[PDB]
């Protein structure tokens, strides 16, 4: 047995020099045992123990060197001092008992601290790197726990650091990479050029391969680029060798075919499937459940029958039993075979590797593929379920019932019919509770009153004040609703059925009394229970008051622009808003880097095609991963030729301040640097409402009358609208028209006579007669109810 006490006293054994390595070791062992089994104790005593132990250390008694390692080893994230050895670690360090040296460092590292961290370091560097593979291994492990704590101390070393990871032992080679699990956690790019290194060389450890796979895979999901050759390359690689695991590993993800890859891969897979198909890799079971997914394609499915038939047949191997349920499921089944199986199952399920659990899982799947649906099956199943039984169905029922509800099943009359009956003579009060509750809600939306009543009475029939009680409670939702005959009678019934038995009496009385207390109708009720989208933005913007004009928003942006490209530290997405008077660019964001918070932020814009520039606004502070707002404001000139479409030049200015995210500091100092700000271009669709005309005929002409500018091109290398088309529907954001829009994948002639209204109120109108002689020569008209738009449309459309 275990107990601390003998040992502390026994520490006086330390006092002897005549000792045998055995004798002491055992004593040492005894302490360790209590602990291996489990012990808990005071530090003081531990400390003491140390001292006591520590005390002994003249020798190199090798054995002695190990035990302590253990002992020490026992302490690592919940330690007591560090310093004591120190010398001893060094002593190894100059000292060639190679062996020993390695264990000791390793413990320290969960226990570690930064100053002390300082210690090893030149050497350490060496040490990780040093000699025989053995020693090196010892070194490695040590970090990791320190990585818990941190490890960055290490980290730093890195450009330089990795390269040594270059290996010549398999075991080792495998190992190097995980540390690279975290290395790749740190970096993706690095991998990529890296891979070409991993990719570059054929590998040693099956083990090494594996991490890569996950990774490799991980990469693949969205696509790991043109895996074609790599994937392929890999594909061999996974595919064959003398180490099975890889082939399989690859296999489970890789399918690809809903009308997709199936080529080589299905055969190879088959070689495997079959090969596995009797517990080579008892692994095979899991896969079918998802890892290697199945829900088939139609001829494909027919082919599957044989393999599943082997498992189905075999009935053995825990790995087998599971396999039977998934394979059968995934591939699906005919009715008929089920029948054979039901009998098989009849024996099987109880224990046949403890079939019941796999089966409950299987069952959970059954309830799902048919959760009261193929009700005939549901009933067949139901009969069978209850029947094959044991008892273990109940658990299943919890799921099954749930499934039926999920559908909100409709062959309830029948479904319910089975349930009702069987449950009656399939017992368990507990089920009733659940079902009651559900039923409780449902009532007269599904009618069949007499039956349902018929049932209900029965349910009550059973004793239990409690059993009885549910029929009344369910009823409240029901009663209230009434059904194909109920209200009159509903009133009659509570009367007809009535009970004593005191608290059972009371239940009748009380419900009544309760009933007594409200107008039963009431009773039931209580108990039972422009100036666009963009304008909104004009207002949203409005809470600020530094304005220099606004108006009401007319239309907003046809496209928000990320003003800082992808996943940048100062990630910007920008949205632009037009009002009848001003345009505001309000800037949406995630000052990205946790490096930074940007401060003293304002936004420069500098313009080419007019706007009067009132102000650049910036956000006061922007910390990491959190929108803040900065704005830039303009007033929109409307009656000029060239005056609201503009590109503005952006430069971000800030005083850049570093962060501690743990607990920061926010101080007046910090220094600016400025980074380029992306262009803003302003559109002819941030401003416009596309329309249909108040008066096309007239308007159409009219707009010409006052307004009209023209451009002609004659098209001699291409006889297609389409280029033009890409620029026009899309740039203007207006409607192509006069039933003069439509073109199939070809068409002889086309007119878009097109619409919307521009900001500042007045309209911008376009007629594009595209004419095909067989060259295209075309008349583009822009006509407008605003001056700035006719010149604009012709440009803007591009």
């Amino acid at each position: 047995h275990l107990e601390k006490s003998a040992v502390l006293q026994e520490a006086r054994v330390f006092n002897e020099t005549p000792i045998n390595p055995r004798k002491c070791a055992h004593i040492l062992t005894k302490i360790l045992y209590l602990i291996n089994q489990g012990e808990h104790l005071g530090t003081t005593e531990a400390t003491e123990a140390f001292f006591a132990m520590t005390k002994l250390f003249q020798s190199n008694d090798p054995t002695l060197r190990r035990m302590c390692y253990l002992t020490i080893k026992e302490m690592s994230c919940i330690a007591e001092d560090v310093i004591i050895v120190t010398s001893s670690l060094t002593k190894d360090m100059t000292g060639k008992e190679d062996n020993y040296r390695g264990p000791a460092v390793r413990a320290l590292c969960q226990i570690t601290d930064s100053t002390m961290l300082q210690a090893v370091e030149r050497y350490m560097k060496q040490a990780i790197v040093d000699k025989v593979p053995s020693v090196s291994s010892s070194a490695l492990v040590s970090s990791l726990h320190l990585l818990k704590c941190s490890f960055d101390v290490v980290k730093r070393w890195v450009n330089e650091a990795q390269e040594a990871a270059s290996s010549d032992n398999i075991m080792v080679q495998y190992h190097a990479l995980g540390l690279l699990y975290h290395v790749r956690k740190n970096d993706r790019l690095a991998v990529s050029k890296m891979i070409s290194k991993f990719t570059r060389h054929g590998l040693k450890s099956p083990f090494a391969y594996c991490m890569m796979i996950r990774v490799a895979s991980k990469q693949l999901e969205e696509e790991d680029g043109s895996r074609d050759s790599p994937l392929f390359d890999f594909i061999e690689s996974c595919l064959r060798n003398k180490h099975e695991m890889v082939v399989y590993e690859a296999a489970s993800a890789i399918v690809n075919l809903p009308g997709c890859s199936a080529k080589e891969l299905a055969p190879a897979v088959s070689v495997l499937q079959l090969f596995c198909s009797s517990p080579k890799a008892a692994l095979r079971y899991a896969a079918v459940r998802t890892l290697n997914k199945v829900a088939m394609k139609h001829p494909s499915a027919v082919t599957a029958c044989n393999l599943d038939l082997e498992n189905l047949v075999t009935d053995s191997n825990r790995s087998i039993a599971t396999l039977a349920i998934t394979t059968l499921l995934k591939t699906g089944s005919e009715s008929s075979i089920d029948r054979l199986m039901k009998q098989i199952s009849s024996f099987m399920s109880e224990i046949s590797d403890e079939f019941k659990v796999v089966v409950v899982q299987a069952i959970s799947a059954l309830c799902q593929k048919y959760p009261r649906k193929h009700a005939v099956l549901m009933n067949f199943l139901f009969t069978m379920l209850r029947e094959e039984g044991g008892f273990e169905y109940k658990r299943a029922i919890v799921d099954c019932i749930i499934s039926i509800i999920e559908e909100n099943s409709e062959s309830k009359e029948t479904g319910l019919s089975h349930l009702c009956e069987f449950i009656e003579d399939c017992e368990f009060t507990v089920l009733a509770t659940r079902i009651l509750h559900l039923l409780g809600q449902e009532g007269p939306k599904t009618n069949n009153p007499s039956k349902y009543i018929r049932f209900i009475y029965n349910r009550v029939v059973l004793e239990h004040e409690e059993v009885r009680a549910g029929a009344v409670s369910a009823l409240a939702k029901f009663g209230a609703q009434n059904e194909e005959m109920l209200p009159s009678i509903l009133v009659l019934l509570k009367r007809c059925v009535m009970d004593d038995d005191n608290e059972v009496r009371d239940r009748a009385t009380f419900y009544l009394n309760v009933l007594e207390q409200k107008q039963k109708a009431l009773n039931a009720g209580y108990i039972l229970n422009a100036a666009t989208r963009q304008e909104i933005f004009q207002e949203q913007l409005a809470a600020v008051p530094e304005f220099q004009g606004l108006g009401p928003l007319f239309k907003s942006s046809p496209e928000p622009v990320a003003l800082t490209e992808s996943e940048t530290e100062y990630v910007i997405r920008c949205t632009k808003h037009t009002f009848s008077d001003h345009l505001v660019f309000q800037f949406d964001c995630t000052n990205t880097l946790n490096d930074q918070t940007l401060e003293n932020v304002t936004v420069q814009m500098e313009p080419t095609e007019a706007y009067e520039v009132l102000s650049y606004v910036p956000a006061r502070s922007l910390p990491y991963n959190q929108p803040g707002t900065c704005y830039t404001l303009v007033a929109l000139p409307t009656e000029d030729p060239t005056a609201v479409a503009c590109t503005f030049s952006c430069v971000m200015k800030f005083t850049v301040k570093d962060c501690d995210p743990n607990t920061g500091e926010i101080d007046e100092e910090g220094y600016e640097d400025e980074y380029v700000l992306e262009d803003l271009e302003v559109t002819v669709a941030d401003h416009i409402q596309k329309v249909m005309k108040v008066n096309f005929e007239a308007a159409w002409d009219e707009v010409g009358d006052e307004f009209e500018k023209e451009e002609t091109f004659t098209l001699s290398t291409i006889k297609t609208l389409e280029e033009a088309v890409g620029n026009i529907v899309k740039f203007l954001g207006m409607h192509p028209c006069e039933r003069s829009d439509k073109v199939p994948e070809n068409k002889n002639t086309h007119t878009l006579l097109l619409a919307g209204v521009f900001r500042g109120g007045h309209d911008i109108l376009v007629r594009s007669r595209l004419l095909l002689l067989d060259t295209v020569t075309m008349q583009v008209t822009a006509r407008s109810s605003e001056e700035l738009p006719v010149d604009i449309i012709l440009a803007s459309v591009g």
Binding site: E503, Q517, Y526, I527
Partner: protein, 119 residues
């Protein structure tokens, strides 16, 4: 009030399993005397600490069920003359002192503490 006090005392004395909402209902009656004869908000506070305690325990987690609540009325039940009284109850659905007491009582927390002590 004698009865009320007795009830509270016995309740304190017990604690080790049961089930009743129904009982609550049973003491109350259609009407009944409570407090001096009225202490309004303070009285709302009165309802709040005595009932809250029952509740606090209620709020806590379970083993075997004792009974899944259907205290809908429970809610009115807690909150010309008759009509006025009803209105007051609806609105609800010395006083300050009562509220404070209830807060202090707030009995899952007590149970948790006991468990910790045992550990």
């Amino acid at each position: 009030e004698d009865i009320q006090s007795v009830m509270t005392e016995v309740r304190r004395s017990l604690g080790e399993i049961p089930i009743v909402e129904s009982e609550i209902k049973k003491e109350a009656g259609e009407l009944k005397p409570e407090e001096e004869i009225t202490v309004g908000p303070v009285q709302k506070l009165v309802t709040e600490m005595g009932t809250y305690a029952t509740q606090s325990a209620l709020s806590s987690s379970r083993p075997t069920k004792k009974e899944e609540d259907r205290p809908p009325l429970r809610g009115f039940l807690l909150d010309v003359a008759a009509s006025l009284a009803t209105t007051l109850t609806k609105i609800a659905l010395f006083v300050a002192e009562a509220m404070l007491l209830m807060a202090t009582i707030l009995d899952v927390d007590r149970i948790s503490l006991c468990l910790k002590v045992l550990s």
